[PDB]
């Protein structure tokens, strides 16, 4: 993993030692180069994992996530350099440094062979994320958003730290491989019930679970565009990845401990999809849609089937790409009208035709239109849930109906109808914005040709 | 602010005639029943006091609501018609011409010269029409959404730009 | 009761301005001015041959158009598809599986050469 980690670390000296006007060029070029290198991790094995050293390993679950992170960094850089054009050289370098630090922490988080190292790296992601949100966000609400995000995450994470050190003291190891191979069944007792809750709640609040999600609208809305991109695309997936890793020590306690969480997510996907139907803030609507897809991921991980895990992996990848695309599309309109209100700028298809096409593609992917990998993940999870209990088809069908309704409603209200009469500053789409959408959408569709690359290690 | 009694009687006359036309369809039948309807409206044409005239209007409106055609004929481009607001997707605002690339504009030199002439007109006349609006609007602000004509030679009616330069009904 | 003098005057002034605006939307003979372009030799033979557009030239122009369309849209794709099926798809089992032909009494089987026996004598229902 050092052939990936060290180039990323080298982004910092290069960023700080480059000319004031070569900052974005250099960072973009070499982050794309690092993303090219990360693709070689997709050469996986059927049975074993890629166990490089004692401290880093890679399997079919973490390799697509690593590729997604390394890909997100350059797109972040293209999205940021517009609203940060008037900033000072040192402050731009600090923003780039925060993004690089976040990518480095995420890369080591997804490959950490030990549970406590994973914990520290997954907690380290808070610091640059919080800095981005609170320093470079636009509104006075960014401070409260930062506090919510920080303290929700930490209230989740500290009991996990206690549980992890207890597990290390009783089992002798926190090594992922050892944990799998020396797996003990978890008995039915209050001690084990609370150990389960401690092992699960941090990833629950990270995803987030419905009812523990109130930080996410604040944080994903108040953050600058790159912050929203990472928060929606890679940071939510830390909960799903960690839950997939740690559920191997929670059986058979997960059989009945998951019932409250299964109920919460199955109903809260309905609840948050309905909320999207009435959201007056475009960025808030996009933030609220992440909760439903992540609720589907929660159900898939909690029912513990090969098909459910495959669907959850594919859904995490597809949601990362699609949610980041939607945030970028909303940000392009925000940078023109300086507002997130959705009915402010209507009838945009007759002013920005290719951007309207990008909007249609993003809405279609959020719709989970087949054969997109969004649909593959959603359908696999739906089938596994149907096996788990047939009655799950009522709620999941309702959810896909409501998802269609709000996705197409957003498309219609922003792109269609009559343009607003007094808004006379909708300049033509820049090459940079169109390239941002294209680099969001093209790899999403190419994955349909090789879907096994994102179906996880249970494929 | 409000509709007078005469206005309301006329609106009901027009609406009832149109729904009668939707019911009758054929032109001779519509002519016959339209003359009968006009006789109904002419029966109380000269009514002394407006209390019973208004009661007649109320009864006529209740009758109209009972007997209206569920789907009356609608002119295609009128609200609720089948061609209503069909051409909004082509009505590009005129400020988009400024954001054209200089190579798009060079294909239309004469048009953009005329457009610069209109823009110079608008820029020049703007101050003396805000002035006229101030000099004509009584204290407390406007009471009606009406606007004045230009009153002296050389001036343009205030707030004329977006009325005069509005998109055509069949733009693209 | 009709337009007021102010309404009538403002309407006629807006009418004059609007009519001047609408007359100004007309294009000039030079407009739009086109930028230069290049002509390929395949279409260079047509501005010298089809410059007349005779009935015998129209038939040959449609023939060239239809032959080029036929080869590029039918013959090349059918070539690629037939190659794909004949040498890649059917190089794996059960990829193209064909429902077997119905076999009737009397029939001679091509492969082996056997003759299917004729049915037994009908009980002879007579209409």
């Amino acid at each position: 993993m050092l052939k990936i980690i060290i180039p990323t670390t080298m982004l910092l000296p290069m960023t700080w030692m480059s000319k004031h006007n070569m900052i974005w060029i250099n960072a973009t070029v070499h982050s794309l180069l690092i993303s090219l290198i990360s693709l070689s991790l997709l050469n996986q094995l059927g049975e074993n994992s890629l166990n490089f050293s004692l401290t880093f390993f890679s399997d079919s679950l973490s390799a697509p996530l690593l590729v997604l992170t390394t890909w997100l960094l350059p797109l972040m850089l293209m999205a940021s350099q517009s609203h940060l054009s008037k900033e000072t050289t040192t402050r731009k370098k600090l923003y780039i440094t925060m993004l690089i630090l976040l990518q480095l922490f995420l890369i080591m988080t997804f490959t950490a062979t030990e549970l406590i190292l994973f914990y520290i790296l997954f907690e380290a992601t808070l610091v640059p994320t919080l800095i981005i949100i609170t320093r470079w966000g636009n509104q006075t609400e960014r401070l409260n958003a930062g506090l919510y995000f920080l303290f929700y995450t930490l209230a989740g994470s500290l009991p996990l730290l206690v549980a992890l050190v207890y597990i290390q003291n009783t089992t002798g190891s926190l090594n992922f491989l050892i944990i799998h191979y020396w797996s003990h069944p978890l008995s039915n007792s209050w001690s084990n019930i609370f150990m389960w809750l401690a092992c699960i709640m941090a990833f629950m609040v990270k995803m987030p679970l419905y009812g523990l999600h109130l930080w996410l609208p604040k944080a994903h809305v108040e953050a600058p565009i790159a912050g929203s991109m990472v928060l929606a695309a890679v940071l939510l997936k830390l909960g799903g990845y960690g839950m997939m890793r740690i559920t191997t020590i929670l059986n058979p306690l997960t059989n009945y401990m998951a019932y409250p969480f299964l109920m919460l997510s199955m109903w809260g996907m309905i609840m948050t999809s309905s909320i999207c139907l009435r959201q007056t803030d475009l960025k808030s609507l996009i933030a609220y849609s992440s909760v439903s897809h992540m609720a589907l991921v929660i159900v898939a991980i909690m029912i513990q089937t090969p098909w459910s895990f495959m669907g959850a992996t594919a859904l995490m990848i597809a949601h990362g790409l699609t949610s980041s695309m939607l945030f970028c599309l909303a940000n392009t309109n925000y940078e023109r009208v300086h507002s997130r209100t959705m009915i402010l700028a209507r009838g945009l298809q007759t002013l920005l035709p290719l951007m309207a096409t990008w909007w249609l593609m993003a809405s279609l992917t959020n719709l989970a239109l087949p054969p997109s990998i969004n649909l593959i993940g959603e359908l696999f999870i739906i089938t596994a849930s149907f096996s788990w209990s047939n009655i799950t088809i009522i709620l999941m069908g309702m959810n896909m109906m409501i998802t269609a309704l709000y996705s197409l409603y957003m498309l219609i209200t922003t792109q269609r109808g009559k343009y607003t009469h007094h808004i006379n500053n909708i300049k033509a789409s820049f090459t940079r914005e169109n390239a941002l959408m294209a680099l969001h959408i093209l790899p999403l569709l190419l994955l349909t040709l090789n879907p096994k690359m994102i179906l996880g290690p249970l494929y | 602010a409000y509709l007078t009694h005469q206005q309301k009687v006329l609106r009901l006359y027009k609406r009832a005639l149109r729904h009668l036309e939707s019911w009758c369809v054929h032109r001779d039948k519509y002519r016959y029943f339209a003359c009968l309807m006009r006789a109904r409206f002419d029966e109380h044409k000269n009514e002394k006091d407006m209390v019973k005239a208004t009661q007649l209007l109320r009864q006529a409106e209740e009758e109209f609501w009972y007997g209206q055609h569920p789907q009356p004929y609608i002119f295609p481009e009128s609200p609720g018609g089948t061609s209503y607001e069909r051409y909004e997707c082509y009505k590009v605002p005129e400020w988009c011409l400024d954001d054209w690339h200089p190579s798009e504009k060079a294909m239309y030199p004469d048009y953009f010269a005329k457009r610069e002439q209109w823009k110079r007109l608008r820029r020049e006349s703007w101050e003396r029409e805000v002035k006229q609006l101030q000099e004509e609007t009584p204290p407390g602000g406007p009471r009606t959404e009406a606007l004045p004509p230009a009153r002296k030679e050389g001036d343009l009616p205030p707030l004329w730009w977006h009325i005069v330069t509005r998109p055509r009904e069949r733009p693209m | 009761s009709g337009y007021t003098p102010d309404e009538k005057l403002r309407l006629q002034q807006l009418r004059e301005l609007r009519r001047r605006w609408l007359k100004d939307q007309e294009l000039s003979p030079r407009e739009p001015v086109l930028p230069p372009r290049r002509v390929w030799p395949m279409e260079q033979f047509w501005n010298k041959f089809l410059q007349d557009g005779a009935p015998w030239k129209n038939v040959i122009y449609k023939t060239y158009r239809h032959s080029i369309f036929a080869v590029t849209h039918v013959l090349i794709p059918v070539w690629i598809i037939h190659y794909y099926l004949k040498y890649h798809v059917t190089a794996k089992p059960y990829t193209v599986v064909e429902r077997k032909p119905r076999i009737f009494p009397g029939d001679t089987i091509l492969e082996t050469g056997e003759v299917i026996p004729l049915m037994k004598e009908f009980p002879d229902q007579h209409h």
């Binding site: 002013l351 169109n434 | 605002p93 005129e94 954001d99 798009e104 055509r168 693209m172 | 939307q25 294009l27």
Partner: peptide
Amino acid sequence: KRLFIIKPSGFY
């Protein structure tokens, strides 16, 4: 008669 059609910039 040909009229000028107002459309957004298609150049970019």
